[PDB]
């Protein structure tokens, strides 16, 4: 296991525009296109992202290219966030994957509400952190995926995958 295999499990692969768990137009491996309800706006974002007129459909190679870009942007964003970087750098490699997964799903400006979880993780109080992480809209809206990510934070193993 690694971050690519982990997110591939959690996000799936679809080659035509679809709506994600929040109702937002998405393609590929969890590549969010727009929060706009206008499919034409999503199609324009897709064409801009791929560099050609896609008419709402991409290839597997194109999906994997967007995925590589999105994972890299997620990690770099963590490193450029003064609240997230110290916690991320304190973690082992498996738990770092759980952190990337969470930012990939919720956006770096969507983890803002996780101050107390972040402190418990940096303290390595793993069971307490796991309890705190589940007291969240994140967990309640996507409980089976959140349970996998939290088990990864709790144990530092890939047992949930
Ligand atoms: C909330 C995402 B996250 C970022 C760094 C460390 C742990 N989790
Ligand atoms: Cl709650």
UniProtKB/Swiss-Prot annotation:
Keywords: Antimicrobial, Bacteriolytic enzyme, Cytolysis, Glycosidase, Host cell lysis by virus, Host cytoplasm, Hydrolase, Viral release from host cell. GO terms for biological process: cell wall macromolecule catabolic process; defense response to bacterium; peptidoglycan catabolic process; viral release from host cell by cytolysis. SUPFAM superfamilies: Lysozyme-like. Coiled coil: none annotated. HAMAP family: ENDOLYSIN_T4 (MF_04110). Endolysin with lysozyme activity that degrades host peptidoglycans and participates with the holin and spanin proteins in the sequential events which lead to the programmed host cell lysis releasing the mature viral particles. Once the holin has permeabilized the host cell membrane, the endolysin can reach the periplasm and break down the peptidoglycan layer. Optimum pH is 7.3. This is Endolysin. It is found in: Host cytoplasm. InterPro entries: Endolysin_T4_type, Glyco_hydro_24, Lysozyme-like_dom_sf, Lysozyme_dom_sf, Phage_lysozyme-like, T4-type_lysozyme. Induction: Expressed late in the viral replication. The active site is at residues 11, 20. GO terms for molecular function: lysozyme activity. It holds the Pfam family Phage_lysozyme.
């Amino acid at each position: 296991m690694n971050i690519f295999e982990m997110l591939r499990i959690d996000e799936g692969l679809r080659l035509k525009i679809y709506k994600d768990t929040e109702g937002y137009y998405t393609i590929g491996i969890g590549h969010l296109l727009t929060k706009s309800p206008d499919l034409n706006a999503a199609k324009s974002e897709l064409d801009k992202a791929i560099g050609r007129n896609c008419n709402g459909v991409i290839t597997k190679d194109e999906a994997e290219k967007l995925f590589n870009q999105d994972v890299d942007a997620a990690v770099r964003g963590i490193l450029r966030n003064a609240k997230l970087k110290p916690v991320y750098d304190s973690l082992d490699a498996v738990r770092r994957c759980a952190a990337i997964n969470q930012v990939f799903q919720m956006g770096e400006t969507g983890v803002a509400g996780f101050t107390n979880s972040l402190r418990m993780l940096q303290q390595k109080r793993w069971d307490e952190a796991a309890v705190n992480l589940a007291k969240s809209r994140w967990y309640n809206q996507t409980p089976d995926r959140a349970k996998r990510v939290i088990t990864t934070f709790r144990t530092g193993t890939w047992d949930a995958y």
